[PDB]
Design an enzyme around this catalytic site. Structure first.
Site, PDB file in Angstrom:
ATOM      1  N   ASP A 226       0.845  -1.184   0.000  1.00 48.46           N
ATOM      2  CA  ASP A 226       0.000   0.000   0.000  1.00 48.46           C
ATOM      3  C   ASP A 226       0.884   1.239   0.000  1.00 48.46           C
ATOM      4  O   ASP A 226       1.995   1.224   0.537  1.00 48.46           O
ATOM      5  CB  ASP A 226      -0.941   0.008   1.215  1.00 48.46           C
ATOM      6  CG  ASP A 226      -1.883   1.196   1.223  1.00 48.46           C
ATOM      7  OD1 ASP A 226      -2.212   1.704   0.131  1.00 48.46           O
ATOM      8  OD2 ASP A 226      -2.300   1.619   2.321  1.00 48.46           O
TER       9      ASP A 226
ATOM     10  N   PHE B 298     -14.420  12.264   6.606  1.00 52.67           N
ATOM     11  CA  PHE B 298     -13.913  11.674   5.375  1.00 52.67           C
ATOM     12  C   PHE B 298     -14.380  10.232   5.226  1.00 52.67           C
ATOM     13  O   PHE B 298     -14.448   9.477   6.200  1.00 52.67           O
ATOM     14  CB  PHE B 298     -12.384  11.724   5.358  1.00 52.67           C
ATOM     15  CG  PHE B 298     -11.755  10.871   4.291  1.00 52.67           C
ATOM     16  CD1 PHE B 298     -11.863  11.212   2.953  1.00 52.67           C
ATOM     17  CD2 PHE B 298     -11.048   9.728   4.630  1.00 52.67           C
ATOM     18  CE1 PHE B 298     -11.281  10.431   1.973  1.00 52.67           C
ATOM     19  CE2 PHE B 298     -10.466   8.941   3.654  1.00 52.67           C
ATOM     20  CZ  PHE B 298     -10.583   9.293   2.323  1.00 52.67           C
TER      21      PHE B 298
HETATM   22  F1  ALF Z   1      -4.755   2.119   0.184  1.00 53.46           F
HETATM   23 AL1  ALF Z   1      -4.258   3.251   1.470  1.00 53.46          AL
HETATM   24  F2  ALF Z   1      -3.761   4.385   2.755  1.00 53.46           F
HETATM   25  F3  ALF Z   1      -4.492   1.974   2.694  1.00 53.46           F
HETATM   26  F4  ALF Z   1      -4.028   4.528   0.246  1.00 53.46           F
HETATM   27 MG   LIG Z   2      -2.975   2.888   3.811  1.00 48.34          MG
END
Ligand code: ALF
Ligand SMILES: [Mg+2]
Length: 1138
Positions: free
Chosen positions: A484, A590
């Protein structure tokens, strides 16, 4: 079915029978008098009980049958129902329930019903099931929220708690006390539960069989070894149970409205429907149970449920029109306090007329208690209803049969050779049984759990905690690793680059390169920077919230206020411009679907330079530029080009926009509370672009390089913009070649520099040259549009980066990747990934926490599981991404260790059996002292070998996951054949040297002989050789010579054996009852042993060099260009070491 739950297969109703009707009582008390009458008569003595030792055989056989019949009730559950239960006609006469769950999801058990006052219930896996007469079935418990008609809010708003003592007692009887039931048992309980396992009984039976032949010291030694092994297993289980028990929350006093009065009640006595006063939590504690906030306002930190430390604002329900509006969870997600989450702050900002609590906290209503909460359900599924380490026991139980085939062949040949020369039948049968039972190793199905526990301790050394131990072997074969972007591969401390687009230099494409500092900015831009924020200030004086808001507030220079207001009215040279105050009235949270913040405030802002006084209600919105274009009243002519140019370099930009509702005076709470999301977000102007630089973590490049260079493939999934994700992937070196984006302008390929544009159809297959020549980056929109076409499979194989992905689409991608058979690993921290960590094979919750905090604790580094979370199976407390390879190394060790153990165990058993066979064809037997010394030496060698360390880095090779393959079987067969050939040659040479007397008498008190000593020395040397030749530690562990701990033991035992064989110490041979040798016999024995060791080592080395390397999957295959670059950089690293 009898029960209504997706985790129980079938169940029926039973009733116990008296003791005399059991299956292990009546048939045997029928059989035994018949055998007694047969034994007591003399004319019916023709059934071969003439010899006195066949009475022992028959008695032992019948007692063994009775013991097996009794133990069959404890071994299985269906046999228990067949042996001591009888089927019941109806529920009125039932007394026991047999429950079998869905396979590989727990253990089947029997349970006892309880009938209270009408109510029929029973406990299974610490969960209470209740009978419903209308549905004619059992089911789980029911609560007020989960009712089919959604209750009105007036049920909660006008609630006064429980006002009747009888109602309190009824609710206490119906539900349970609010506590976690994880009782650790004493040593005796685990020892009694572990003494009826089949392998312990088998070992005791083998001990008795060896004791029947007057082998006293050997039986005592193996009994002691078995006892201490069981003791250490029980101790490990008890330690694991204590570590799991340490997750619960200690009781703390709370204030509860009962019987019309406020009373101080312990936390464990909470019941559904109660009215409690929630306040500021203490250190190392949390909320007692699931709550709904009727009145008040809370600032909480749901660390355990999600893994993110950013505080959230929970509002009450005292404002909603609860007279007639039904309750929903989509809109009321902001008014539920989940259990196990710490509470940071309480603020007040009643319809029922209840007096306020004395502690000035907020008021809440309890919804669920005990194990029925989300954290409680997760804990219950974690502890009881979960997979085990092996859970199948199919390959090991076939390996045992594979060894038993050779055992049976050897025993049959021994029996035939003994019956040809007319030996005594009883002793020959006992020898055949002893040969048969000496092959099965009792710990062969085991030794995967112990290695898992050792790896778990080694991982917990690195501040990495695991909750499901059965996923550790899954880490030994991971082929795809997912990551991620925000929160995992990027740092937490951001830098405010500046503000652009408020109004100039212009490029060829029309982008504006104007760079305006924060200090000199517009009126509306500064005001919307001040107001549009979700950060909060603690009463103690600390500042918490989203780090981006912290960075922009530090760049702004304004100073917060106590009553959630922002002001810069005192003269400060840092601001130099707009001054006044703003008071936030409403804040909008959000969410992953809207990607926007909207805030309403009362503003009084003044500009010293030009005046332009501003007062009244105002609304400010921030977020993604595309949503701003969706809500822009005037589209700028240089928006998209400037946005693309500023996001090309990897800087993260956010669109800021403003609107004024009333030019003078406050809006008014009547229509402030009446405003909706769609009404307030309309006809908005434009304020600017806040552009920032996101810094890479300093361990990202090394970890990604190590993962890519090994037998893995790394892909990146994120919910950010495509260009920023592409730039981050290029900096991280996930992608090497030129990449192509795939997006709507419908379903068109574009380039990063927008030089080429390709139109494609969603139905037709993708052009192969696109898949081959260039990399791919597929967005979430077209991933949704590719749900069922023929190109869905290929798009899941050739792309590496995903952008703008919904939380559901992440788990959809992970499920699609797992459908092909690839093993996946996922790492994440936020709540956007919590739906995908459980779907993956192994999931890591990268809790970004300071190591200074870990070192700061002193009680009064290993820590406990209390501070961890339950969002993902694996949790680490350090911000380093380099924790991800460590797990992927540790499992890679475990399998390897398991593999070597298998080989060693099998070979050892085989050798021993055939050794006895060579002894049992001549009528001579091994001595007690010699076999005891051999067992002690083997145990010492095992204890010396069992300790080892790990290599600091990963390697391009992979371990073999299963048992049945070419490597293990071929190595075992070759080494066994070499050992058997050497033993046969030594036996033939010893028969040639000394003739056999052929006088067979069983009254031999171990007269020393040449054959006995020769076979004893050969088997000792062969066991030491197979101990020291199967050390699987070249690529993944350290070599034998690089660690002295086992090397010294190996050389010491080898030197002892060689000193025995060389006749250098005549007293030592007499200490073990050995016949003296001569020169030629000693020389030929030494040469035979050396040849044996050399041939075994050569065969093992050739087979390991040939068949050990498991080939990489086609998805992880790398191009020769990457290999050449890696080799060049590796030689550069080799040169620059000095
Ligand atoms: F996919 Al993410 F912070 F968990 F942008
Ligand atoms: Mg993330």
């Amino acid at each position: 079915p009898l029960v209504d739950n997706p985790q129980i297969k079938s169940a029926e109703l039973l009733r116990p029978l008296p003791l005399y009707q059991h299956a292990y009582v009546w048939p045997y008390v029928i059989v035994w008098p018949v055998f007694l009458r047969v034994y007591l008569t003399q004319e019916l003595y023709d059934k071969y009980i003439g010899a006195q030792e066949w009475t022992f055989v028959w008695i032992i056989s019948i007692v063994t049958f009775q013991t097996l019949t009794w133990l069959c009730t404890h071994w299985s559950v269906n046999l228990n129902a067949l042996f001591t239960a009888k089927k019941a006609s109806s529920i009125e006469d039932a007394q026991l329930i047999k429950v079998i769950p869905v396979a590989n999801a727990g253990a089947a058990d029997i349970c006892k019903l309880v009938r209270d006052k009408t109510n029929i219930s029973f406990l299974f896996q610490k969960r209470r099931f209740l009978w419903y007469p209308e549905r004619k079935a059992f089911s789980t418990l029911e609560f007020d929220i989960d009712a089919e008609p959604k209750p009105t809010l007036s049920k909660f708003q006008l609630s006064r708690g429980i006002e009747s003592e009888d109602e309190l007692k009824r609710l206490e009887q119906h539900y349970g006390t609010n506590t976690f039931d994880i009782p650790v048992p004493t040593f005796t309980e685990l020892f009694k539960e572990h003494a009826v396992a089949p392998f312990f009984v088998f070992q005791v039976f083998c001990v008795g069989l060896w004791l029947l032949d007057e082998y006293w010291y050997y039986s005592l030694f193996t009994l002691v070894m078995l006892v201490v092994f069981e003791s250490t297993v029980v101790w490990q289980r008890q330690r694991t149970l204590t570590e799991f028990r340490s997750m619960s929350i200690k009781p703390y006093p709370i204030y509860v409205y009962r019987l019309g009065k406020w009373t101080e009640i312990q936390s464990d006595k909470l019941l559904p429907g109660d009215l409690v006063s929630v306040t500021r939590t203490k250190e190392d504690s949390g909320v007692a149970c699931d709550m709904i906030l009727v009145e008040g306002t809370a600032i909480v930190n749901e660390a355990m449920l999600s893994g993110e430390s950013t505080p959230l604002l929970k509002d009450s329900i005292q404002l909603r029109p609860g007279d007639a509006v039904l309750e929903v969870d989509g809109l009321d997600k902001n008014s539920l306090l989940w259990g196990g989450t710490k509470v940071l702050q309480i603020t007040h900002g009643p319809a029922s007329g209840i007096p306020p609590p004395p502690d000035n906290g907020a008021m809440a209503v309890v919804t669920k208690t005990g194990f029925e909460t989300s954290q409680g359900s997760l804990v219950r599924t974690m502890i009881y209803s979960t997979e085990r380490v092996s859970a199948n026991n199919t390959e090991a139980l076939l390996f045992i049969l594979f060894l038993l085939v050779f055992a049976l062949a050897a025993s049959w040949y021994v029996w035939d050779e003994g019956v040809r020369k007319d030996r005594k039948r009883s002793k020959l049968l006992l020898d055949c049984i002893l040969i048969i039972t000496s092959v099965v190793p009792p710990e062969l199905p085991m030794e995967l759990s112990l290695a898992v526990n050792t790896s778990l301790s080694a991982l917990a050394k690195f501040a990495i905690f695991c909750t499901e131990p059965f996923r550790i072997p899954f880490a030994g074969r991971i082929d795809v690793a997912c990551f991620d972007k925000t929160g995992t591969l990027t740092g937490e401390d951001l830098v405010v680059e500046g503000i652009a687009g408020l109004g100039t230099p212009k490029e060829a494409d029309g982008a504006h390169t104007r760079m305006v500092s924060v200090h000199d900015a517009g009126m509306e831009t500064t005001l919307v920077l001040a107001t549009a924020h979700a950060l909060v200030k603690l009463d103690e004086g600390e500042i918490v919230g989203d780090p981006m808001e912290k960075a922009t507030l530090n760049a702004l220079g304004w100073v917060l206020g106590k009553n959630d207001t922002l002001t810069s009215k005192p003269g400060n040279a840092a601001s130099s411009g707009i001054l006044g105050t703003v008071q936030i009235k409403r804040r909008f949270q959000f969410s992953s679907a809207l990607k926007r913040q909207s805030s309403v405030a009362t503003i009084t802002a003044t500009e010293v330079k030009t005046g332009r006084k501003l007062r009244g209600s105002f609304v400010g919105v921030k977020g993604a530029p595309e949503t701003i274009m969706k809500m822009l009243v005037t589209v700028p002519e240089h928006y998209e080009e400037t946005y693309k140019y500023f996001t090309r370099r990897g800087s993260r930009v956010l669109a800021l926009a403003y609107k004024q509702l009333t030019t003078e005076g406050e809006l008014g709470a009547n229509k402030i509370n009446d405003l909706k999301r769609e009404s307030v977000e309309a006809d908005l102007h434009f304020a600017g672009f806040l552009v920032l630089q996101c810094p890479l973590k300093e361990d990202a490049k090394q970890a990604v390089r190590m993962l890519n260079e090994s037998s893995h493939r790394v892909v990146m999934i994120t919910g950010d913009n495509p260009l920023t994700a592409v730039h981050v992937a290029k900096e991280v070196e996930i992608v090497d070649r030129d990449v192509l984006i795939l997006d709507a302008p419908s379903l068109v390929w574009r380039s990063v520099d927008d030089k080429i544009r390709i139109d494609v159809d969603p139905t037709k297959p993708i052009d192969p040259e696109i898949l081959k020549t260039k990399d791919l980056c597929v967005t979430g929109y077209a991933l949704n549009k590719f749900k069922g076409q023929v190109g869905w499979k290929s798009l899941l194989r050739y792309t590496w980066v995903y952008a703008r992905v919904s939380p559901k689409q992440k788990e959809d991608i992970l499920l699609g990747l797992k459908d092909m058979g690839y093993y996946t690993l996922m790492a994440g921290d936020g709540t956007n990934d919590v739906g995908a960590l459980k779907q993956a094979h192994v999931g890591v919750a990268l809790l970004n926490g300071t190591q200074e905090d870990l070192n700061r604790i002193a009680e009064h580094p290993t820590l406990k599981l209390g501070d961890a979370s339950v969002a993902a199976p694996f949790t680490s407390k350090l911000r380093n991404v380099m924790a991800i390879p460590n797990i992927l190394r540790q499992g890679r060790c475990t399998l390897v260790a398991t593999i070597q153990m298998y080989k060693i165990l099998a070979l050892n058993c085989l050798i021993s059996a055939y050794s006895l066979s060579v002894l049992y064809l001549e009528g001579i037997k091994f001595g007690d002292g010699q076999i005891t010394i051999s067992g002690m030496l083997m145990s010492v060698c095992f204890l010396s070998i069992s300790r080892a360390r790990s290599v600091e880095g990963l390697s391009k090779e992979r371990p073999q996951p299963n048992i049945f393959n070419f490597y293990i079987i071929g190595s075992i067969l070759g080494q066994f054949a070499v050992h058997v050939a050497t033993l046969i040659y030594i036996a033939q040479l010893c028969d040639q040297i000394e003739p056999r007397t052929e006088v067979i008498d069983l009254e031999a008190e171990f007269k020393p002989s040449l054959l006995n000593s020769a076979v004893y020395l050969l088997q000792l040397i062969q066991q030491i050789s197979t101990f020291a030749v199967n050390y699987q530690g070249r690529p993944f562990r350290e070599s034998l010579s690089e660690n002295k701990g086992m090397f010294y033991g190996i050389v010491g035992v080898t030197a002892i054996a060689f000193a025995c064989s060389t006749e250098m110490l005549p007293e030592l041979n007499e200490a073990m009852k050995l016949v003296p040798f001569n020169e030629n016999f000693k020389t030929i024995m030494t040469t035979v042993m050396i040849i044996d060791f050399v041939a075994c080592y050569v065969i093992e080395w050739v087979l390991k060099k040939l068949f050990s390397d498991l080939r990489a999957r086609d998805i992880a295959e790398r191009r020769p260009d990457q290999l050449e670059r890696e080799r060049v950089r590796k030689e550069k690293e080799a040169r620059e070491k000095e």
